[PDB]
Design a protein around this motif. Structure first.
Motif, PDB file in Angstrom:
ATOM      1  N   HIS A   1     -33.724   7.556  40.943  1.00 61.98           N
ATOM      2  CA  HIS A   1     -33.498   8.344  39.728  1.00 61.98           C
ATOM      3  C   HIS A   1     -34.550   9.434  39.504  1.00 61.98           C
ATOM      4  CE1 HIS A   1     -30.834   4.968  38.638  1.00 61.98           C
ATOM      5  NE2 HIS A   1     -30.270   5.806  37.788  1.00 61.98           N
TER       6      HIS A   1
ATOM      7  N   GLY B   1     -30.393  10.086  44.248  1.00 55.20           N
ATOM      8  CA  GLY B   1     -29.044   9.599  43.932  1.00 55.20           C
ATOM      9  C   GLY B   1     -28.033  10.726  43.798  1.00 55.20           C
TER      10      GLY B   1
ATOM     11  N   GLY C   1     -29.524   0.701  40.188  1.00 56.37           N
ATOM     12  CA  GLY C   1     -30.433   1.437  41.062  1.00 56.37           C
ATOM     13  C   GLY C   1     -29.708   2.202  42.154  1.00 56.37           C
ATOM     14  N   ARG C   2     -28.452   1.827  42.399  1.00 57.75           N
ATOM     15  CA  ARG C   2     -27.650   2.353  43.495  1.00 57.75           C
ATOM     16  C   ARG C   2     -26.580   3.376  43.055  1.00 57.75           C
ATOM     17  NH1 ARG C   2     -30.319  -1.827  44.489  1.00 57.75           N
ATOM     18  NH2 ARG C   2     -30.821  -2.566  46.616  1.00 57.75           N
ATOM     19  N   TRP C   3     -26.015   3.192  41.860  1.00 52.85           N
ATOM     20  CA  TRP C   3     -25.028   4.112  41.274  1.00 52.85           C
ATOM     21  C   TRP C   3     -25.401   4.407  39.824  1.00 52.85           C
ATOM     22  CZ3 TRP C   3     -21.552   6.207  44.443  1.00 52.85           C
ATOM     23  CH2 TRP C   3     -21.216   5.521  45.620  1.00 52.85           C
ATOM     24  N   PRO C   4     -24.959   5.559  39.280  1.00 51.99           N
ATOM     25  CA  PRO C   4     -25.289   5.900  37.892  1.00 51.99           C
ATOM     26  C   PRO C   4     -24.450   5.107  36.900  1.00 51.99           C
ATOM     27  CG  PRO C   4     -23.905   7.612  38.837  1.00 51.99           C
ATOM     28  CD  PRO C   4     -24.175   6.622  39.942  1.00 51.99           C
TER      29      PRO C   4
HETATM   30 CL   LIG Z   1     -28.466   6.659  40.916  1.00 48.92          CL
END
Ligand SMILES: [Cl-]
Ligand SMILES: CC(C)C[C@H](CNC(=O)c1cccnc1)Cc1ccc2c(c1C(=O)O)OCO2
Ligand SMILES: CC(C)C[C@H](CNC(=O)c1cccnc1)Cc1ccc2c(c1C(=O)O)OCO2
Ligand SMILES: [Cl-]
Lengths: 148, 148
Positions: free
Chosen positions: A129, A136, B50-53
């Motif tokens: 982030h 990301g 942590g991997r996708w928004p």
């Molecule tokens: Cl993200």
């Protein structure tokens, strides 16, 4: 380039942190494991490839390159397994700097989590982030551009 | 809409499969856990965010909605925790059909894996890659459109 990932294995608190870096974006996924085995690496790669389009993986050492379980996982998931030799020498330094950055974040959150695995996932979050685009945002744009 | 996820918990072989579905795309992430606790759900959400928004999560039941650990994880990760009440009744059926589809894939791969957790990750892979676009392609496009 949008399908290229690099494996990275670092150590902290007597445990092993396994990291996959998307080379073009700096985006990462990570897990804590008791020890780096072929089996653990293979399982980690299966998880990764179900979540992102993994075309090529640069393995982190010769043992994982050689492992029959890692080879089986790469076959299963349609991944081309390559070495991680830094033919471009700046590759080593970039990885090393990321490991230092990650350990620093882990130390900054370490108090908010009882367990190391939790702190690692918090560090993944903060890394992905961090802004000016974030890692990301970059991985999504790179892959979206590729599909289209 | 690009930030909305739904939690889903299903059972197989006396174990629990925890699933997160990206509502707009049908893309999933999943894990096998011994039992659905607040702590397990909280940890799963930290990984996901942590991997996708992840902007909003529709929790799968009242216990996880109430859990202080789940609330702590949602606070930490900047996630709006909502209920998963299917105000649109077709939501239940869509989730149920996905659970059936996933169990079917698990059965088709079950022989290639010693452990259920491995079979589940293979099922995630097959689901996200299934074509006409795939869920993996759709989530990336939706999110990329949103950034831009
Ligand atoms: Cl993200
Ligand atoms: C969301 C964060 C802010 C808190 C959350 C709960 N922990 C505490 O309240 C806490 C804080 C400080 C010292 N001791 C406990 C962290 C967490 C979530 C899920 C898990 C965990 C952990 C973990 O603490 O490692 O372990 C495996 O499943
Ligand atoms: C990539 C697949 C095709 C094979 C791979 C190795 N398994 C076998 O060869 C096998 C197959 C059937 C019966 N007994 C063994 C699967 C695998 C990878 C990593 C893991 C695993 C497993 C697992 O088997 O669950 O357990 C946790 O870490
Ligand atoms: Cl994918």
């Amino acid at each position: 380039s949008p399908g290229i990932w690099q494996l990275d294995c670092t150590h902290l608190e007597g445990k092993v942190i396994l990291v996959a870096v998307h080379v073009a974006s700096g985006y990462i996924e990570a897990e804590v494991i008791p020890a780096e085995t072929g089996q653990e690496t293979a399982y980690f790669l299966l998880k990764l490839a179900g979540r992102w389009p993994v075309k090529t993986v640069h393995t982190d050492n010769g043992s994982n390159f050689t492992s029959t379980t890692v080879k089986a996982a790469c076959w299963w998931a349609g991944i081309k397994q390559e070495d991680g030799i830094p033919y471009n020498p700046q590759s080593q330094g970039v990885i090393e700097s990321m490991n230092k950055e990650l350990k620093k974040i882990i130390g900054q959150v370490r108090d908010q989590a009882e367990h190391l695995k939790t702190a690692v996932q918090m560090a993944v979050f903060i890394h992905n982030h961090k802004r000016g685009y974030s890692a990301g945002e970059r991985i999504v744009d790179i892959i979206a551009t590729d599909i289209q």
